[PDB]
Symmetry: C5
Subunit: 332 residues, 5 copies
């Protein structure tokens, strides 16, 4: 094998066909798993198989079998091999247990297949201002490092059919949909033009979990705060603790929701809901102070429900309804 190929009779720092046109190289990918997601750092981790095809007649051998052979890794450092890399990546590695996950098959003609197994972490810019009703889209990019479109030609081996995805892929916090591929040509100011391949996909959440954990308790709190309009205004020590305890409860809920968020420092769509229900509960406590002050001054002036109570009984819910209509018209 090491003899079948005239390894010492050629020069492999030289791309196959240095001189005239660019070498065609064709790519095939199969995704094994998506491993983790960070919302704070804005990135994701994926593990896949990567395959390459090309022809190099320096590697042809005399056999009659019309069938391929096999090598692994050691030969990659003797021969010439392409040099793809992952664009917009934070870290990556190739697996090496119990030996290097690298495969090499060569036919009599010198046609070649070359394959690896890798894990990549790759950046994805996200926007959380519609949280928890956001949708995100991410991508993985592949490019040649050293050779430009005048020396190497990059393309998907079988067009739209060059991506395969494993059956058992899932996340404990997301739903994954819409895998597909595309291409684009890209330019560097000090080095030139290159071809680039993409893999795209889309993410969404489970909205009912967030509904019950956040929107439901605050609504029950705002509804608890309307009870005070139906209690006798003469019962001061039963109308005064109620409001302030309700404020305490709502502040506890809001604090509890703040101590578990992914810690991204700009205003999002649930913060608005929570702070508006805080303001409603606060107004309910101003109302009864108005009523008490007026009843007391009347008592002093002289020496039945109050108008403000029987008006609040109507006004407060209608305005909560009006707020909910507008809010869900804006975030749908």
């Amino acid at each position: 094998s090491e003899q079948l190929l005239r390894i010492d009779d050629h020069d492999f720092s030289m791309r196959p066909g240095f001189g005239g046109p660019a070498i065609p190289v064709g790519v095939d990918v199969q995704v094994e798993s998506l491993d983790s997601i960070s919302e704070v750092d804005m990135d994701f981790t994926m593990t896949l198989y990567l395959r390459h095809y090309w022809k190099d007649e320096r590697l042809s051998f005399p056999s009659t079998n019309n069938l391929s052979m096999t090598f692994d890794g050691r030969l990659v450092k003797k021969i010439w091999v392409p040099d793809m890399f992952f664009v917009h990546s934070k870290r990556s590695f190739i697996h090496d247990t119990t030996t290097d996950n690298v495969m090499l098959r060569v036919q009599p003609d010198g046609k070649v297949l070359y394959s690896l197994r890798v894990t990549v972490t790759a950046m994805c810019n996200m926007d959380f201002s519609r949280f928890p009703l956001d949708t995100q889209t991410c991508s993985l990019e592949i490019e040649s490092y050293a050779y430009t479109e005048d020396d190497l030609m990059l393309y998907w081996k079988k067009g739209n059919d060059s991506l395969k995805t494993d059956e058992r892929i899932s996340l404990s916090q997301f739903l994954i949909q819409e895998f597909h591929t595309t291409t684009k040509l890209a330019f560097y100011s000090s080095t030139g033009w290159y071809n680039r391949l993409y893999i795209n996909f889309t993410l969404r959440r489970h909205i009912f979990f967030f509904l019950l954990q956040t929107y439901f308790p605050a609504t029950l709190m705002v509804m608890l705060s309307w009870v005070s309009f139906w209690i006798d205004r003469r019962a001061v020590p039963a109308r005064v603790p109620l409001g302030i305890t309700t404020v305490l409860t709502m502040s506890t809920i809001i604090t509890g929701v703040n101590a578990s968020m992914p810690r991204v420092s700009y205003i999002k769509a649930v913060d608005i809901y929570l702070w508006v229900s805080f303001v409603f509960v606060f107004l309910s406590v101003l109302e009864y102070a108005a009523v008490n002050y007026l009843t007391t001054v009347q008592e002093r002036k002289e020496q039945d429900t109050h108008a403000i109570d029987k008006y609040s009984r109507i006004i407060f819910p209608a305005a909560y309804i009006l707020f909910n209509l507008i809010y869900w018209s804006i975030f749908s």
Copy 2:
């Protein structure tokens, strides 16, 4: 030794017997420990010994002893060795202190034994919708990377007896049961067919700890909320703070249970319990407002227990009982 074997007289990029049938290779495993589990990331970590057997007559030597020899590691890179790898793995390594944990024994015939010590992290899809009453099953998969069933034949060396497990294995959060092995043949669309080996096992939790930490306090809270049906309706400042303080207490408990969960964003079987006891406590606070409003309007109209109290005293517990029956009929 390096001379006993004609190392320079052979070609080891070539599998033993390249040409005709596939080489038989036989595997034996002993598990040392399970090291950690992640419920958020859905994976586990294990450490084991791995052993291989095969015959290669390029390694035979003239001795009369009918007994094996020993080598370590350096020789593995001179001779031909198989290339197994762990399927659906996130990371792994071989230990190297104070030197490489690799052993090699060869007999006069050329029969070989080869062994390593490794640690692997490996994915396991879990479903937590019955939490804390869930059960999970995981597995470790082993496969050849480079050679197909037409070049290498993979099997357990001794059938069901090829797995051994250490005596002192345990986790601080789980109970481990039912180790066993099996096999399956698997197919890749661009490379072909391979043999694969499995090791399976099962996990369970301690249910009484979760019972006391979560289900018990909420039940005592719902039972505390029924006390208010037996207090005099004329005692407004002693019936009004009770309910709202009880709501405060229950919200504190629920928040405390949310700040320690493994953070998996979909609805599970304990969330339902907690939110239904929240709704019961909320209804208890609506009840006394009904009673107060009615007594007040009667006082105004004119100028003994109330029916609603003596009806609630019966209705509320029966419905809590009915909820518990249905809930534990569904989750058993």
Copy 3:
């Protein structure tokens, strides 16, 4: 190629032109992304491309094409290459998947271009005493390790135009502004003088998020504490729980704000706001004790609003206003 260049006919431990003047070396940078920031550890992480230019006539070759060639990495360890390093850095590495991200281009003259892809973590001293109204500025420094200004001359290749920045750069907690470059000469007491290059930039926060999360609820709490001046002093069991519950609420808010801060142990500008509103709420609770004690002793002496109430109704808000004026005059 390895032959075109007389590799074995020269000595590369020797800088080009050892002897007379210093070699000119010129630098070009393109920033890909800012990856993370730590406020506790005072540092940041960046990923970029780095490019070098120089001439070495040991690498010239006879060709007529007036056009460059290509190599990658392996050649870097055969020839002489500069040795820049990142000053005030905690950690860094060069990417190596699927092979080393290193490029090398040589023209017939022996002019050279050399480029890498790296990730660096680099220290930045920050001062948080104006938090959340702080502004920070950071920088990345580049220097030669081994050769002084008498052997190597470091400069930007194109002056102000030698820095390029990617379009899609962002952080989930900051706004980035004002990239520019400069230079400075620097001195080591036991080794001598060197040239150094800088890249500078500036950071700011989103102030409205911090406003709503911190300053707003405490203000509503201080305003809730003024309600007690308008309730009848004869209603002791409705004036005594109010203050103490309000204290409870404010302490809960402050504790909630302390359990999420970046944990830097010196006094900052929001702590002052929070503790002054604590002191206001505390004084409101001392006030009514004064009023109760005086009314009781008058009752005992003998056997209408009180002056202190109708004075507090004016004094407390004016002093809160006066505090806000001074505070926002100091932090603007």
Copy 4:
């Protein structure tokens, strides 16, 4: 030196004396520090020096000095060296700054000394059911990887005197006592018999810190709940809030103790204490409801302390005392 020893005249893949009996190899250890402990993962980290002694007459040299020489590391890969490894370990490494921490001394006879500096993480099964009154014992195990008791003989160089421990060893959460060594022979089903060395030690906690942080406040809470037996039963709005506020306080304490525990999911000895004091506080709140209901029905029937109060004043503390006696008889 490299010449003094006839390196190229011998074969070092071959253990000294391959053939007849087993080589004696003798071990000496000095512990520098214990570095960290994990209670969740059940393991510890230690750093030490390790020393070996043996004789190999392939390394003898003609000198008259009767005194040893020195080498470092590079020679270890030319000659034959033993292959010990740490049994039941999760990770380890050898230090390499500013070069490899390896020492080698050889005398004229061929006697050898060989020493390293390493850090190891090693598993320790712990049982926390007596927490905070638990005691744990851990150990570090040392074994040959490749050679059995028929090829290598492992023993402590000086018996009980072969372990030394540094003066300045401590942990910020434990007290360390009782270092000693021992040996045992161990068996592998597919490879055979080996010798193994042990180092053992013991751990304990500071019990008074846990006492004040956990047992003290709950006791004061249970004692606060007995005050309600001495207040007038006619004071409903002063007897009804007291109990429920006390329940709130105790639930806050318990939640605070749950949010800081090492997160091991089975019932331990402090959980029992806390939940029994919860049940006592709950019964105190049922008591006064009984008393109120009875007084009210008597008032209705007709139209002085109550017996239940003056009985509870005696019964509740005695039963708390009886619980404490039994509890501290069981956990001592």
Copy 5:
């Protein structure tokens, strides 16, 4: 250069002058930064430059220039170099981007200078029983690994002037003071005597931040608890909730201070303050129960301030004052 020095004509496994006396080697250090501190693990991280000087006439070359040359790294593995290491260290490394941060300068005589750039984590035993009023001192130790005082002599190159410290060094949680150096001779029982160098320094905190965050709110709580001595004893429903709410508030504060401490399990000087103010608040709640019981029994016996109130008004503060005097006499 590689020729100027007769590399192949000498033996470098042999220290310069093997035989007679010990080689003098002299050390110079410059500290770049202190990077982080762990109070739980008791250690710190530092980054510095390290320099060595010695003479070796195997490296002399014929030149007339009386001036030094330069090499980098590759030569270190051809020639003989010392072998210093950091004593009591947990981890360390040498920086290697964009190449190895190693410098080598040789003069015609064979005098040598050798320098590196490293980061070290190093243990420091701390005692927190005076927290937050503690002071700590730490050190970094440097020693030869392989050679004893009979083969190598270690000393500071310029005495007290051999340490330089960067201008821009700081921590976000500490103040750093008092850098200085010293030396000591040290002994190993199985290997012998060595020289060791030290760098020492001192740390302190910001005490006013801890004062306002911890001591201030508890004091205001103890002062709030004295208000109850001035309210009318006839106002039961206004004297009974006050104490218990105050207890709730103080327990919340203490829990909040426990959920952010560096988690070191022994009693410290702030714990005492907090638990004594807890006991004061608890006694204030026992007091009014005494007063109520006595007034009630007098009412029953028959059918103005109470003595206990007008005595407590004096006794409680004086004892708080007396506690503060003693406490701050003990911790100063």
